[PDB]
Amino acid sequence: TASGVNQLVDIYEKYQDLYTVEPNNARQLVEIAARDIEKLLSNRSKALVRLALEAEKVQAAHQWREDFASNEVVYYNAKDQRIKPVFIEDANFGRQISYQHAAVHIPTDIYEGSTIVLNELNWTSALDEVFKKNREEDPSLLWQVFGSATGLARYYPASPWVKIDLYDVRRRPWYIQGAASPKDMLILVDVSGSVSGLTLKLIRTSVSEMLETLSDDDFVNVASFNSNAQDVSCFQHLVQANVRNKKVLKDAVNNITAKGITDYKKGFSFAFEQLLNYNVSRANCNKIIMLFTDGGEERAQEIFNKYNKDKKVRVFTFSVGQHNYDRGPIQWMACENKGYYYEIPSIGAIRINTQEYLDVLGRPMVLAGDKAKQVQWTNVYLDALELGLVITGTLPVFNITGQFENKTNLKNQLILGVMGVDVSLEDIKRLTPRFTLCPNGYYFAIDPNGYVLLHPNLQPKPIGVGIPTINQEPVTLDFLDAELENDIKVEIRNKMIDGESGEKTFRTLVKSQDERYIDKGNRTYTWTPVNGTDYSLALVLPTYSFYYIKAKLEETITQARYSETLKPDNFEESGYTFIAPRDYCNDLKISDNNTEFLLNFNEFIDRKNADLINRVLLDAGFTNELVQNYWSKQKNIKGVKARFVVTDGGITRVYPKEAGENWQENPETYEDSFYKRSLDNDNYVFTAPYFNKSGPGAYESGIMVSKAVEIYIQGKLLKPAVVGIKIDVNSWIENFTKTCVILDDGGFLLMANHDDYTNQIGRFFGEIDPSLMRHLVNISVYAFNKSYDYQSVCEP
Amino acid sequence: SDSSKQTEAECKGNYITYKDGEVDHPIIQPRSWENSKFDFDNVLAAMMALFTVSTFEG
Amino acid sequence: ITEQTQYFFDNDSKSFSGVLDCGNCSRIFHGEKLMNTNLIFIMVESKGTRLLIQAEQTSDGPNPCDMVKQPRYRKGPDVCFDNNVLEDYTDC
Ligand SMILES: *[C@@H]1O[C@H](CO)[C@@H](O)[C@H](O)[C@H]1NC(C)=O
Ligand SMILES: *[C@@H]1O[C@H](CO)[C@@H](O)[C@H](O)[C@H]1NC(C)=O
Ligand SMILES: *[C@@H]1O[C@H](CO)[C@@H](O)[C@H](O)[C@H]1NC(C)=O
Ligand SMILES: *[C@@H]1O[C@H](CO)[C@@H](O)[C@H](O)[C@H]1NC(C)=O
Ligand SMILES: *[C@@H]1O[C@H](CO)[C@@H](O)[C@H](O)[C@H]1NC(C)=O
Ligand SMILES: *[C@@H]1O[C@H](CO)[C@@H](O)[C@H](O)[C@H]1NC(C)=O
Ligand SMILES: *[C@@H]1O[C@H](CO)[C@@H](O)[C@H](O)[C@H]1NC(C)=O
Ligand SMILES: *[C@@H]1O[C@H](CO)[C@@H](O)[C@H](O)[C@H]1NC(C)=O
């Protein structure tokens, strides 16, 4: 009675006009969005290809000057002969841009003016005219970048570089991906007696500095040998080098100790055996054996004869530390097998060496001329210029000098660099418009590795691993770890990785947006591949979200009175109104402050997207008609502390206009936990306010009560609003006592007859009387699910 | 200064030292192609640097 | 890696009753769901151990040395450029 749940259903039903309940086809909706995303990742493929050919056709004619005392190369070094640029503050990138040249970032210890670098600043000065052509062809093209394999990156929209600059392009994920194909590394650390001391500190450092050059689609293991070959970790086969699997290997390498004689035969006979293990789902090429050692005598020729006779495995060898052992046998092993030999004398020589083997793995890529220039999108990572969550498309550029003279007996099998073009996720979340869906529905997409690009539970912060300690990885959330696992969402995931297109309706648990409640619900997972890439755009809809209210309104009078309806001065007699900040052409989003935005909104509709602004007005009037007709009449009902309504479209109203100051739920309706929670049930829901928060409440705010607003407008079910009240506890305390704990799912105390329990309202019932709950759980009431939230912060 | 640059022309600019050998905690220091304290370029510098040896100091 | 937990009703049964055996004593509870509402009403014999927690508490992830035994499904790429004959192996 107080809220007016059936006092609004009539209002929505009364205005049969001003509606058109249209259906979400859920198959023409995925395909029309999975074809827009494919178009986006294809425009960034033209910008790439057009960039590779221009940096390959200019390299060919450079002439290799060696005298820059005159004809000085001119460029804008990012950390500030040089260019003094003019910077325009562009809100798109969030920093200062110039648009008139390309910045250059020489790493912090590559000499800015050496000969090998001053040439690189010359023949890459012909890219500036195709960097400018690309965006001038299509704006909203964020970062072109040429990652030259001499340290340099020439990223186009020249911003000041973002405390020591350890950035080095040759290690960024978008480079090690373009520059080489998936690997099967196998590090053979040599933990024997002779590496005791400093040589071990460099081996443990350098190993953990090589596991950082491994993507998520290439496997790794870390053996070791001291007259018996074992594993440092507990794995016993190749383990994919995820964000997590690496941490097991890095933390097991760091806890290694030198002891015992050195035996190269028994330690290579263990490496070659773990590369033949073909029932582990390995990445089935670029087998490698990266031996770390100091120096020995035995070149185990009979091992490289039994195994690796036909030269399939590449033995890279590192002779790390300062010593005087024979580096002769080691050099033979890397030369006989198709490898290379690196020397790591001390720290500082670790970073520049462990990234070099990609120049070797990339040899069979250059020779495969244009079957190897294929765009390739990195898994989501955090941009290194404070842009947000981005994905980059990589495309190598080869060195065509002397080509068509058929000289090609040279350094013509190395790559100049990998060049990339960043796509931000906040640009993919704009090709999947969420507002013709219920708050529960959403799109998502996954890699062929399972990691979700574009998921609503993908927070823009680095993924976590392990409990922290007292004292460049990408954001890779697997699809089964962003949502509650069940034996049906495994089938969905396994059928999206294979690229199949289908549909599947089932009843599933859905975690509440505030990680406190779980809701059983019906969900229909539609998915379809994004042709021309390797992704699977899916779309999940509640079974009642198959229709949405698209408003038709052209009278300019009915919306006129709607316009002043939500003016801030009319708030006493029409509730304290909020609007969800949403995407309009030029209207400015909040500064975390809603009331500024509500003021902003009025001018832009006063002056003259179409649907979003058309729908918000219809809700404002439809809500206002309630808050004027019924909510105003029966003012100040006894048990009520506040009466609120929320709609899809933004309008959120509270009558007292004093309780509005105590309205904690954020103005975005599509993120309100209760609005999603109550939309899913077919009854009332009680959301216990948290216990012992930083902010006040739970006495002057009461406890929320909510109910959906179901409508059968033309025989079609809709739930387009949620009305509810904030019940004061004190009024409800007496009616309880006039009749012991009252309780809701999730075990949150609402009231107790005893008034020490009711003092700590909202606490988890089970931090109160745990002996009851553990027994109460075990009577097949109060189930519990235990998921992991890989993106969260801890103090130690 | 950078133990990995073995000539004049390659030893210019900055490089990354690590204090106490800790792998973290970098320090940016310049590269200096410096001769030894007591060198043998001249006969006179050779005599001075042989004197300090015959003193048993350094 | 915080480890969240959430609770909800298993059975749609409304009437609950039983006996506690916490220690050197016993208790009787009765519990009834407020029908057509997300609520549960229980009383137990007036008061006479270890805490349960619902807030997310820090924990190491799932045993990584065990999920690799039976890993998730995965499809790697297929370009796979390696092992070309016309390559100069004169570098070392
Ligand atoms: C994908 O390609 C097929 C042709 O094989 C096409 O008919 C279909 O519309 C495409 N689907 C999407 C989502 O692009
Ligand atoms: C893609 O490029 C074409 C080229 O003209 C342009 O018309 C289109 O708007 C672009 N679309 C996107 C999503 O960038
Ligand atoms: C290379 O430098 C020379 C003189 O420094 C100049 O002739 C030439 O334009 C430069 N190359 C490019 C691509 O600008
Ligand atoms: C380190 O390795 C030793 C080897 O016996 C083992 O006893 C110890 O538990 C390990 N510690 C850690 C933290 O891995
Ligand atoms: C995998 O291969 C290993 C080594 O040959 C063998 O011991 C093991 O039984 C195999 N496992 C499976 C699942 O085939
Ligand atoms: C490419 O190879 C040629 C010799 O064919 C060499 O002169 C040129 O410097 C190489 N490319 C780069 C970027 O150094
Ligand atoms: C409330 O939280 C603070 C946080 O520091 C804590 O110190 C205090 O003991 C808590 N009080 C109750 C009653 O939970
Ligand atoms: C959640 O708990 C229920 C009831 O115990 C169980 O049936 C289900 O498998 C659990 N689901 C998850 C994702 O743990």
Side-chain angles (χ1 to χ4, degrees):
Chain A
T1 61
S3 74
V5 63
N6 288 151
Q7 305 172 1
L8 188 153
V9 176
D10 54 321
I11 278 179
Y12 267 49
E13 286 159 331
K14 175 187 275 145
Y15 303 113
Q16 189 63 42
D17 57 355
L18 288 72
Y19 280 179
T20 300
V21 289
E22 283 297 314
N24 301 316
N25 204 358
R27 175 50 73 152
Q28 205 165 17
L29 210 66
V30 188
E31 292 180 354
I32 200 66
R35 207 180 309 120
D36 289 1
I37 283 179
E38 169 181 315
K39 194 82 169 61
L40 171 66
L41 308 185
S42 174
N43 270 354
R44 317 301 213 246
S45 176
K46 313 289 186 57
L48 263 173
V49 167
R50 183 159 57 244
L51 270 176
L53 275 69
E54 188 82 355
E56 276 193 349
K57 203 198 60 178
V58 164
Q59 168 61 39
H62 163 44
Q63 203 36 50
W64 187 266
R65 292 187 69 222
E66 202 175 2
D67 44 357
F68 301 96
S70 54
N71 299 108
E72 278 276 349
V73 291
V74 58
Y75 73 109
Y76 171 53
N77 189 30
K79 311 184 272 200
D80 289 343
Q81 76 186 301
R82 314 288 174 72
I83 295 187
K84 282 168 43 61
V86 303
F87 282 160
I88 62 170
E89 172 48 89
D90 186 10
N92 201 319
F93 294 76
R95 48 200 296 104
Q96 307 94 25
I97 313 294
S98 61
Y99 280 151
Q100 299 288 263
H101 41 263
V104 176
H105 160 271
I106 299 92
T108 193
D109 58 330
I110 287 291
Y111 181 48
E112 65 183 1
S114 84
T115 299
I116 199 171
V117 170
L118 281 197
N119 304 324
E120 282 268 3
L121 276 78
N122 209 48
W123 67 264
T124 59
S125 279
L127 281 169
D128 296 333
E129 291 86 61
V130 59
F131 281 163
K132 287 177 206 145
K133 173 199 317 159
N134 284 1
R135 66 176 292 275
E136 195 255 346
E137 183 178 1
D138 66 307
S140 178
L141 182 41
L142 299 191
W143 295 112
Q144 285 108 338
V145 55
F146 169 70
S148 189
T150 71
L152 278 73
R154 199 166 197 109
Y155 55 94
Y156 167 53
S159 309
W161 194 252
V162 72
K163 187 137 173 215
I164 312 300
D165 188 359
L166 277 73
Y167 189 90
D168 188 6
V169 192
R170 283 92 61 83
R171 306 191 73 88
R172 291 320 307 296
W174 65 270
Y175 183 95
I176 309 166
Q177 198 199 32
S181 46
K183 296 170 277 293
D184 287 348
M185 186 180 288
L186 170 57
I187 302 106
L188 285 172
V189 181
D190 166 33
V191 304
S192 78
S194 65
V195 308
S196 173
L198 179 69
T199 316
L200 194 46
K201 177 162 73 67
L202 303 190
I203 292 172
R204 297 189 321 220
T205 299
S206 165
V207 165
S208 73
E209 203 87 20
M210 185 180 288
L211 299 165
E212 297 177 9
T213 67
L214 290 168
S215 297
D216 282 34
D217 62 358
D218 55 356
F219 299 5
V220 71
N221 200 355
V222 184
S224 86
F225 59 108
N226 62 6
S227 70
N228 271 332
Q230 71 265 12
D231 290 326
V232 301
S233 58
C234 62
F235 279 147
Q236 295 160 21
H237 49 255
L238 307 197
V239 295
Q240 187 179 3
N242 295 322
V243 181
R244 183 31 181 170
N245 300 82
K246 284 180 208 166
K247 195 59 173 42
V248 185
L249 295 160
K250 282 174 204 176
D251 280 18
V253 161
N254 293 357
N255 186 41
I256 209 61
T257 61
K259 184 70 174 295
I261 82 170
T262 316
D263 200 358
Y264 287 76
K265 306 197 306 270
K266 287 185 176 183
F268 265 110
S269 176
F270 185 89
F272 282 112
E273 272 190 346
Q274 279 192 357
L275 266 66
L276 312 181
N277 215 47
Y278 270 130
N279 64 34
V280 176
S281 85
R282 317 193 300 114
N284 276 311
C285 55
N286 282 125
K287 281 152 277 195
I288 312 171
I289 300 193
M290 302 216 194
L291 165 80
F292 283 79
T293 185
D294 53 10
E297 182 256 349
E298 184 71 29
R299 56 181 76 181
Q301 301 187 1
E302 65 271 18
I303 289 309
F304 302 103
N305 282 357
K306 179 179 189 194
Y307 309 117
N308 197 30
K309 166 57 82 175
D310 50 313
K311 309 275 191 272
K312 300 287 209 182
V313 181
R314 288 168 179 269
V315 179
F316 292 76
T317 62
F318 296 65
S319 163
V320 60
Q322 271 190 0
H323 62 65
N324 51 9
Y325 297 116
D326 196 347
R327 292 132 185 257
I330 287 162
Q331 274 154 354
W332 172 89
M333 272 185 267
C335 179
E336 191 275 332
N337 314 300
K338 314 168 293 179
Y340 208 93
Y341 164 90
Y342 303 106
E343 277 191 53
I344 308 172
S346 299
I347 322 180
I350 278 160
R351 188 206 76 188
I352 62 170
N353 279 296
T354 57
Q355 73 202 2
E356 298 284 335
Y357 73 91
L358 304 160
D359 293 338
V360 176
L361 296 186
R363 291 213 200 109
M365 187 200 291
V366 176
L367 317 168
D370 280 28
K371 273 77 59 178
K373 291 177 72 68
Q374 269 189 265
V375 194
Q376 210 157 13
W377 299 95
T378 62
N379 50 8
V380 190
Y381 66 98
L382 269 183
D383 198 350
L385 293 174
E386 308 293 83
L387 186 41
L389 278 177
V390 304
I391 75 173
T392 298
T394 65
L395 181 71
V397 302
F398 307 113
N399 184 11
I400 294 169
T401 292
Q403 205 69 15
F404 280 164
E405 285 87 0
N406 287 312
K407 307 175 73 171
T408 191
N409 50 337
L410 286 165
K411 301 195 86 64
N412 279 339
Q413 57 188 7
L414 296 201
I415 58 174
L416 280 64
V418 162
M419 76 189 313
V421 174
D422 297 345
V423 174
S424 174
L425 294 182
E426 293 83 3
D427 190 13
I428 304 187
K429 301 198 176 179
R430 299 209 296 235
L431 296 173
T432 73
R434 185 173 42 128
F435 295 108
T436 184
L437 281 57
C438 280
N440 308 129
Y442 55 84
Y443 296 80
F444 71 93
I446 76 177
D447 280 22
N449 281 302
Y451 309 131
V452 289
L453 184 151
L454 179 61
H455 194 291
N457 197 3
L458 183 64
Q459 282 99 21
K461 78 166 50 52
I463 191 180
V465 61
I467 297 169
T469 318
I470 187 167
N471 271 330
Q472 84 190 15
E473 275 161 344
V475 176
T476 75
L477 264 177
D478 203 334
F479 165 56
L480 289 189
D481 289 321
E483 293 177 350
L484 276 297
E485 292 147 270
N486 54 7
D487 62 358
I488 291 162
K489 281 187 205 205
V490 165
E491 280 156 35
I492 308 299
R493 179 186 170 283
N494 291 8
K495 293 169 76 182
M496 293 177 70
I497 287 171
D498 298 338
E500 322 177 359
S501 68
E503 193 150 17
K504 180 70 174 67
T505 297
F506 56 95
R507 59 171 310 102
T508 174
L509 298 174
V510 298
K511 171 159 44 189
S512 168
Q513 199 263 328
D514 62 358
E515 293 83 4
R516 289 187 291 114
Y517 307 127
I518 289 178
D519 295 330
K520 304 203 70 81
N522 283 36
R523 295 299 221 261
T524 181
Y525 279 80
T526 318
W527 67 82
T528 59
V530 175
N531 285 322
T533 57
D534 289 345
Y535 290 100
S536 297
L537 184 81
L539 158 67
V540 59
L541 278 158
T543 48
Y544 47 85
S545 183
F546 286 150
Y547 303 105
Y548 66 103
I549 308 171
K550 63 168 312 292
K552 51 185 198 302
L553 200 153
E554 321 176 12
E555 191 169 358
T556 311
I557 296 164
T558 174
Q559 65 182 177
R561 50 217 174 90
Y562 294 157
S563 295
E564 69 267 12
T565 298
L566 72 164
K567 286 290 301 184
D569 291 331
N570 312 64
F571 275 5
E572 293 94 353
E573 52 93 19
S574 184
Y576 184 10
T577 298
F578 310 91
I579 281 186
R582 291 180 185 182
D583 304 339
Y584 188 65
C585 289
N586 63 7
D587 205 337
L588 198 72
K589 195 272 281 183
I590 76 182
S591 304
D592 81 0
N593 200 347
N594 189 221
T595 184
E596 322 284 339
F597 176 78
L598 187 47
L599 271 193
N600 285 116
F601 179 66
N602 300 121
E603 293 83 4
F604 293 98
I605 187 56
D606 272 343
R607 186 177 303 121
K608 78 186 287 287
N609 203 339
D611 291 331
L612 269 299
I613 321 301
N614 218 324
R615 174 75 210 286
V616 63
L617 301 173
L618 180 142
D619 291 331
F622 275 12
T623 296
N624 176 62
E625 175 158 353
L626 185 151
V627 66
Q628 293 296 337
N629 268 15
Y630 293 61
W631 277 14
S632 178
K633 269 158 189 174
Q634 196 44 250
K635 197 263 171 186
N636 192 31
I637 298 170
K638 281 198 48 49
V640 175
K641 177 70 75 173
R643 296 197 305 284
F644 60 85
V645 61
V646 292
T647 62
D648 61 335
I651 301 299
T652 292
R653 290 220 159 101
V654 291
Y655 203 80
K657 190 185 152 62
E658 164 53 42
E661 329 302 321
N662 210 355
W663 186 242
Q664 315 281 17
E665 317 285 332
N666 63 7
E668 180 67 29
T669 60
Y670 275 64
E671 310 308 314
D672 289 319
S673 81
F674 71 96
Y675 182 25
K676 292 186 238 186
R677 180 85 166 88
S678 66
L679 200 78
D680 214 8
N681 296 160
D682 205 335
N683 48 347
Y684 302 79
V685 298
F686 289 62
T687 63
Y690 324 120
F691 151 69
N692 194 5
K693 285 300 289 295
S694 55
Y699 287 164
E700 68 278 21
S701 60
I703 62 170
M704 181 177 299
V705 159
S706 175
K707 191 194 201 336
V709 171
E710 313 178 2
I711 290 146
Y712 296 90
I713 193 66
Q714 293 293 251
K716 305 173 182 179
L717 168 68
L718 289 183
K719 295 164 103 177
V722 168
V723 299
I725 62 170
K726 303 208 84 176
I727 284 175
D728 186 1
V729 54
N730 270 329
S731 67
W732 191 28
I733 276 173
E734 314 312 319
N735 289 337
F736 178 63
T737 301
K738 188 70 174 179
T739 58
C740 295
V741 291
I742 190 67
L743 200 66
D744 68 333
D745 59 349
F748 291 96
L749 274 179
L750 290 182
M751 294 183 287
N753 54 351
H754 193 317
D755 272 24
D756 181 27
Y757 287 5
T758 317
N759 184 337
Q760 45 188 344
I761 190 167
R763 198 173 179 180
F764 178 56
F765 194 61
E767 184 178 1
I768 291 312
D769 62 357
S771 179
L772 171 57
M773 184 63 72
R774 291 191 187 83
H775 193 296
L776 188 153
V777 175
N778 197 357
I779 323 299
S780 166
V781 71
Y782 268 19
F784 69 109
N785 296 132
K786 206 164 290 292
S787 57
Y788 293 81
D789 171 328
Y790 288 108
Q791 313 193 327
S792 59
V793 297
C794 287
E795 191 67 88
Chain B
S1 163
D2 189 351
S3 77
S4 74
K5 300 297 175 179
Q6 306 206 355
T7 186
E8 176 66 28
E10 294 169 20
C11 177
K12 289 207 208 88
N14 285 329
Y15 85 113
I16 300 195
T17 76
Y18 295 91
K19 291 177 70 68
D20 264 19
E22 273 192 300
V23 163
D24 47 320
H25 201 75
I27 287 311
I28 286 287
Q29 295 282 347
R31 284 166 172 144
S32 52
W33 181 259
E34 291 305 10
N35 197 314
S36 167
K37 307 173 177 56
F38 286 122
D39 44 13
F40 292 165
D41 291 7
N42 312 327
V43 180
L44 271 69
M47 293 177 71
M48 182 179 72
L50 266 293
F51 188 93
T52 66
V53 170
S54 84
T55 301
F56 309 140
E57 278 309 317
Chain C
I1 297 169
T2 57
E3 177 170 10
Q4 313 157 343
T5 313
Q6 289 92 21
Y7 294 88
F8 60 108
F9 310 134
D10 269 324
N11 289 116
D12 43 359
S13 176
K14 273 71 60 181
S15 182
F16 292 110
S17 64
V19 58
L20 272 71
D21 296 314
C22 181
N24 209 32
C25 171
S26 168
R27 278 198 209 159
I28 297 169
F29 64 71
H30 186 55
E32 178 84 345
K33 295 173 170 174
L34 277 71
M35 313 80 79
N36 201 16
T37 298
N38 188 359
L39 271 193
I40 183 66
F41 181 75
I42 68 166
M43 73 292 291
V44 72
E45 292 275 10
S46 312
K47 303 289 292 295
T49 50
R50 293 283 305 281
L51 275 176
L52 277 196
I53 302 295
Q54 192 262 356
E56 60 192 28
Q57 63 263 55
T58 184
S59 83
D60 44 351
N63 195 3
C65 192
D66 200 14
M67 321 185 318
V68 76
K69 295 298 180 251
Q70 184 178 2
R72 301 214 191 89
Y73 191 68
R74 189 199 83 90
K75 170 181 290 324
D78 62 358
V79 285
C80 180
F81 279 130
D82 72 318
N83 189 359
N84 196 340
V85 54
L86 294 174
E87 174 195 356
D88 274 330
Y89 314 78
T90 72
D91 273 324
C92 181

